[PDB]
Nucleic acid binder design. Structure first.
Ligand SMILES: [Mg+2]
Ligand SMILES: [Mg+2]
Ligand SMILES: [Mg+2]
Ligand SMILES: [Mg+2]
Ligand SMILES: [Mg+2]
Ligand SMILES: [Mg+2]
Ligand SMILES: [Mg+2]
Ligand SMILES: [Mg+2]
Ligand SMILES: [Mg+2]
Ligand SMILES: [Mg+2]
Ligand SMILES: [Mg+2]
Ligand SMILES: [Mg+2]
Ligand SMILES: [Mg+2]
Ligand SMILES: [Mg+2]
Ligand SMILES: [Mg+2]
Ligand SMILES: [Mg+2]
Ligand SMILES: [Mg+2]
Ligand SMILES: [Mg+2]
Ligand SMILES: [Mg+2]
Ligand SMILES: [Mg+2]
Ligand SMILES: [Mg+2]
Ligand SMILES: [Mg+2]
Ligand SMILES: [Mg+2]
Ligand SMILES: [Mg+2]
Ligand SMILES: [Mg+2]
Ligand SMILES: [Mg+2]
Ligand SMILES: [Mg+2]
Ligand SMILES: [Mg+2]
Ligand SMILES: [Mg+2]
Ligand SMILES: [Mg+2]
Ligand SMILES: [Mg+2]
Ligand SMILES: [Mg+2]
Ligand SMILES: [Mg+2]
Ligand SMILES: [Mg+2]
Ligand SMILES: [Mg+2]
Ligand SMILES: [Mg+2]
Lengths: 42, 95, 58, 59, 90
RNA sequence: GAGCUGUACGUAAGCGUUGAUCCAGAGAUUUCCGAAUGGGGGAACCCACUAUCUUUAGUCGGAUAGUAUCCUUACGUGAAUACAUAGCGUGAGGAAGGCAGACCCAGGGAACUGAAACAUCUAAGUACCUGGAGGAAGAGAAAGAAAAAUCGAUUUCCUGAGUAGCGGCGAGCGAAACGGAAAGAGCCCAAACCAAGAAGCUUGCUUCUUGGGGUUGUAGGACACUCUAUAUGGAGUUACAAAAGAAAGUUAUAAAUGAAGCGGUCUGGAAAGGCCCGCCAAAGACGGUAACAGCCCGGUAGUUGAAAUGGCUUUCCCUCCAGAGUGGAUCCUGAGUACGGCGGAACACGUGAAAUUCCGUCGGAAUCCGGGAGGACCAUCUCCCAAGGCUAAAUACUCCCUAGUGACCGAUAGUGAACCAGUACCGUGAGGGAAAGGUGAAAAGCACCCCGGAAGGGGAGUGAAACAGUUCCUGAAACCGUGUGCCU
RNA sequence: GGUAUGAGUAGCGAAAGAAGGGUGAGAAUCCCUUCCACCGAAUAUCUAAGGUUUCCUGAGGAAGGCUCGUCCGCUCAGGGUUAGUCGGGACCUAAGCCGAGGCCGAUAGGCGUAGGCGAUGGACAACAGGUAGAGAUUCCUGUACCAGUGCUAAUUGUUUAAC
RNA sequence: UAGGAAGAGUAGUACUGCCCGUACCGCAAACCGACACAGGUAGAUGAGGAGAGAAUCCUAAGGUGAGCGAGAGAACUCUCG
């Protein structure tokens, strides 16, 4: 039994866009990933 | 460009220098120009839809415009070109 | 959490040992919850003991 | 364009309808592989656009 | 409008095989409800619609030399016209 | 002004001198997500209500608009509670979020490290977080600097000076004024008092509102007195009050015109090169063109140019405006302030002999005969007038734009990234993060034949070259082979 | 970064195959047949998660497949997923999360009331046949059910109270 | 029950019923394990004989012969008698 046990919902609830937007530090992450020009935030 | 399709030009550089002809096409994006009977290439053509028998076709390939001078239809000489405004539209003039 | 009159509030500085070790601390205002009329309407607000001294009305 | 400006709003509205129907039938023929002049499509699209533009300029 | 709701007919071995069962297959707007399709088809073809079945096709992943991407998501409607209705042509 | 329908080494249908494609200004359209704001949500989805149309025989459908929260404000309604007030509703404004990791101000604020250990100290008020944000910010018109018997707001640069100083007097930290420059600009309140109200009983006196007045040092103002202005003049949206518009000029955002060699020969695949002749030059910039071009092309110097939009500068309009002198009877001149104790911090200055400045806490002046500073403090002298506000320029930085420059790089360099790179890939995630440029002048990109299922090859042909053959300039070394002169 | 050496070496990942016929340039390895052998509380049949086109058909055999390959979960084209009743939403709430006002707090924020969201639970109406290259309680035939809507017809209310 | 109320039910008849998912794999070569990896992966069903049994052995339905082979039958190693 390996460390990554996938779940569509858990993925989005922990790491998803709305969760990132729900906190100041999550918004910092989005700002940082935009500044670096990532294709994919969240 | 200083020449357009239908103009008679002299060729002034290359293997066909001294030969004159009628500009058949102009490719202004590439500053290239197709002259009748100039820069003839041998295209090794597979049979297809157009040219169904195929064959080694002798046809014209484009020359860089800077290698043709406009033939003044008056004196039949190569010339540089000016621009003069004649009432309505501007027209090319010779030297 | 600040005096509504004077703006007094927490500010930081050093605690110092006899040996001059420094460690961060605050000074808090001597804020008191009191009923005063802010915009005519009386309500409970933080006011500094200093601001209540003499002037101001509860 | 100048010809469109001649027409009344209501008349342009009816000219649009016709063009919308035309565009629909072109796309239909195209999907059934019964359309040769495929350049017609873009013209009609542009036309519709032109007509909406004039109507919006009226107001 | 109704001709924005119906995009184009769907001409495949499957879609053609049910043109005799009075079942016509269309590509419709991806936001269009099957009710919007039922009234759209009635406004364009002057038919009487019995039922409209609809399915969402997600885009298919296609590579063309290093560059990979998705074809468009589609909404496909199968419109069954009543037994007394006129037929659509194709 | 003749071609055009982006790339990219396709087919098709078309468009264009009745002016296309293309270039610049203005406008229109601008799905959904996102502060996201009708409610919800696992971003790019789901589900409504209220009007007003619309469709159907009616459900079922469609279109348009409105509907978040808080703050301020007006108007309504309105509990316990009688008046009220909270609360609730509606209408106006406003905010929200983002970011140029820069610069700036503020709140909060490390540690490694140095001190050859380490605790005071250093690193360092740095990194970082958070807030405010502005094109700059901050500072700023003396309760200043000084000690000539004098300076006149602030800021930045040079200098003073590694000085004076601070410092387990260790490591280290380290000024300022004077002098020299850049740039310069000054102003408005609070209060006496005056007028007109409202609110109060202080009941004819006080306390709030709006206007006038008024701004400074042995003084200024109020206040009396007089002299001239009541826009004659003056000033202005960069402070000094604040909205407005016009016009002309200019700059930017597209462009136009623009001299002179097809010169003769040589080599060559090709001449811009050699040799020999000319010419233009306010143009011998740069680039391209089959090798190196002032005279071939795009251009270049010079000279013209703008319908539209924006910027700037003048001028007009428009708006706004009182200044001198003479008297110090009386009045006013920033109060929980200044100062002080205690605890901290900032000052180069580590509590010291510690002035000066700020924070928390407590105590707490004088208030014109008054007050502050000159590095404990007192006296004298000198200079200054705090506890209110505003203020351009010289300064800092560069996500950007335009024009350029380089004894800067040239594909392992230079950006991580010359190439569809923050991509692929790795990671649950934050985050980490590559490799990879060159056919030819032109595709002229190898018809045709031959072996082969193809791949691949050999001919033929194109080309200057194909040992330039679609990852194709050059093509080193390792390494892998075939052949053979000498040896074994 | 390239290329050696080790080296034609270790390894080629649990397992039963055989022949005949076919296909094809080519066959231990693809297709068919027959026999044989293996699993059978599974090595069968469903379904959820997760994956996301791998599914079907035709063509292909560079690379991938530890060999081969005519084959393939690979490459290239075209296709393919049908619901009032199945599962989810237009219903419900649990833990938990958010949270108007509010309370607390250098900033940032933390907490929390009303109110929301949130299944792993509650509620909730469809069955049997057929059909097939690729879906099927979804398509078709038959027979139903749930919720609505009008339209005809009587029936009964039409301000003392049917509903 | 508080409230609201002239339309309500009954019968027949014919219409109306949205969005999302639906392919395929799913004890696996398609999921988690870098692999076409002896591992891991919740739930429903899970036949017969002998049997208490879902044990065991052999079988049914159904599924499969497992992506290197041909020989050889030394040492040695492993797994077995
Ligand atoms: Mg993973
Ligand atoms: Mg469906
Ligand atoms: Mg919304
Ligand atoms: Mg040391
Ligand atoms: Mg010229
Ligand atoms: Mg020659
Ligand atoms: Mg050369
Ligand atoms: Mg050159
Ligand atoms: Mg003092
Ligand atoms: Mg002290
Ligand atoms: Mg200090
Ligand atoms: Mg003193
Ligand atoms: Mg004190
Ligand atoms: Mg002194
Ligand atoms: Mg001193
Ligand atoms: Mg004073
Ligand atoms: Mg590089
Ligand atoms: Mg190189
Ligand atoms: Mg090469
Ligand atoms: Mg060996
Ligand atoms: Mg061996
Ligand atoms: Mg072996
Ligand atoms: Mg195996
Ligand atoms: Mg068993
Ligand atoms: Mg398959
Ligand atoms: Mg192989
Ligand atoms: Mg195959
Ligand atoms: Mg049915
Ligand atoms: Mg709860
Ligand atoms: Mg609750
Ligand atoms: Mg819910
Ligand atoms: Mg199936
Ligand atoms: Mg299925
Ligand atoms: Mg496995
Ligand atoms: Mg288990
Ligand atoms: Mg069997």
């Amino acid at each position: 039994k390996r460390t990554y046990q996938p779940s569509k919902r858990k993925r989005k609830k922990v790491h998803g866009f709305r969760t990132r937007m729900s906190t100041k530090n999550g918004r910092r992450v989005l700002a940082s990933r935009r500044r670096k020009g990532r294709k994919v935030l969240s | 460009m200083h020449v357009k399709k239908g103009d008679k030009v002299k060729v002034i550089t290359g293997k066909d220098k001294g030969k004159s002809g009628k500009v058949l096409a102009a490719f202004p994006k590439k500053d290239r120009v197709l002259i009748e009977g100039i820069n003839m290439v041998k295209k090794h053509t597979k049979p297809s839809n157009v040219n169904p028998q195929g064959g080694i076709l002798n046809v014209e390939a484009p020359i860089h415009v800077s290698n043709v001078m406009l033939l003044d239809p008056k004196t039949g000489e190569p010339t540089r070109v000016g621009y003069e405004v004649k009432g309505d539209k501007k027209v090319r003039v010779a030297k | 959490k600040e005096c509504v009159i004077t703006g007094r509030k927490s500010r930081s500085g050093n605690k110092r040992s006899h040996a001059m070790n420094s460690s961060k601390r605050t000074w808090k205002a001597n804020l008191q919850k009191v009923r005063i009329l802010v915009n005519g309407k009386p309500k409970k607000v933080w006011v500094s003991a200093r601001a209540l001294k003499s002037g101001k009305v509860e | 364009a100048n010809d469109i400006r001649d027409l009344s709003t209501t008349e342009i509205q009816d000219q649009e309808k016709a063009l919308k129907e035309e565009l629909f039938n072109l796309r239909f023929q195209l999907a059934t592989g019964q359309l040769e002049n495929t350049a017609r499509i873009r013209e009609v699209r542009k036309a519709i656009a032109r007509m909406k533009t004039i109507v919006r300029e009226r107001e | 409008d109704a001709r924005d709701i119906i995009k184009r007919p769907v001409v495949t071995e499957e879609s053609t095989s049910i043109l005799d069962d009075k079942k016509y297959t269309f590509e419709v707007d991806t936001r269009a409800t099957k009710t919007q399709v039922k009234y759209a088809v009635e406004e364009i073809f002057d038919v009487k619609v019995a039922k409209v079945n609809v399915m969402n096709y997600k885009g298919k992943l296609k590579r063309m030399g290093r560059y990979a991407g998705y074809t468009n998501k589609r909404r496909k409607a199968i419109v069954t016209v009543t037994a007394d209705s006129k037929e659509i042509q194709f």
